[PDB]
Amino acid sequence: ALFGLGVPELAVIAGVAALLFGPKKLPEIGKSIGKTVKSFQQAAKEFESELKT
Numbered sequence: 064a065l066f067g068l069g070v071p072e073l074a075v076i077a078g079v080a081a082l083l084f085g086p087k088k089l090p091e092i093g094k095s096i097g098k099t100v101k102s103f104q105q106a107a108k109e110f111e112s113e114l115k116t
Contacts, residue, residue: 082088093100109115
């Protein structure tokens, strides 16, 4: 499905990823909020198992 399309499509994802990959991401939030966010991730490992207890 190659029709020479995608050039302008890469220009978008480029910055979209630069926002999180670069500055203006405010990682400080991942430190305080990471408590709950990461807290669930630790249990997510069991989610795939669908057992809970």
